[PDB]
Ligand binder design. Structure first.
Ligand SMILES: Cc1cn2ccc(C(=O)Nc3ccncc3C)cc2n1
Lengths: 156, 39
């Protein structure tokens, strides 16, 4: 299968035609996505198979072929880029300054950009192109607009 | 059955469309991984 670093679409043929169920990151031979995109199902890359390796429904993350590899963090100050990959549209960088999710267990960076559900797993990055975490698990605000968390995992 | 298709390289791109506000929200995270607004 294709194991070149980059951003990938996550597709199904189980519904009408081919449907983008979301996105993920291929890094060091590991595929990284949000748990709500695949629900822990195996994935096809050509005639190669990607087995789940690590997942956590609460963090809403899953890794394929290996442990989570993405360890960069938002610096709490600088603007970031959503590399948005929307269903049937060309990958696009969108620059924003993260908001903050205040929780009992502390502060998470957050992004206020709305894309379709099938944009879920689009990688947020820093000025050196490091993946600081993924788009697609967040909140609907008083407006009705979408605010997404910078969901990052742990590297061991 | 799910399959992946490459969509691009991962890279910072100078003069991306610059947009979105930066709200400070009080949130709760449930055991099912659903964020919710505290008020
Ligand atoms: C824990 C869990 C289950 N989830 C199921 C779906 C989504 C989702 O697609 N949300 C959006 C709605 C509107 N605009 C953009 C997005 C990203 C998120 C999610 N999180």
């Amino acid at each position: 299968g294709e194991t070149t670093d980059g951003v990938y679409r996550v597709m199904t043929r189980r519904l009408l035609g081919s449907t983008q169920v979301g996105v993920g990151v291929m890094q060091e031979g590991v595929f990284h996505t949000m748990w709500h995109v695949t629900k822990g199902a195996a994935l096809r890359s050509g005639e190669g198979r990607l087995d789940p390796y690590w997942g956590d429904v609460k963090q809403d993350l899953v890794s394929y072929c290996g442990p989570w590899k993405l360890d960069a963090a938002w610096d709490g100050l600088s603007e970031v880029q959503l590399l948005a990959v929307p269903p049937g549209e060309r990958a696009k960088n969108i620059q924003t300054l993260p908001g903050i999710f205040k929780t009992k267990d502390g502060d998470i960076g957050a992004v206020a950009l709305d894309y379709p559900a099938g944009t879920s797993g689009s990688p947020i990055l820093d000025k050196c192109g490091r993946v600081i975490g993924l788009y697609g698990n967040g909140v609907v605000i008083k407006n009705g607009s979408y605010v997404s968390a910078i969901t990052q995992g742990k590297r061991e | 059955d799910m399959y992946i298709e490459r969509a691009g390289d991962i890279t910072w791109e100078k003069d991306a469309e610059v947009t979105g506000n930066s709200p400070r929200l009080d949130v709760a995270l449930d055991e099912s991984g659903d964020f919710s607004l505290v008020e």
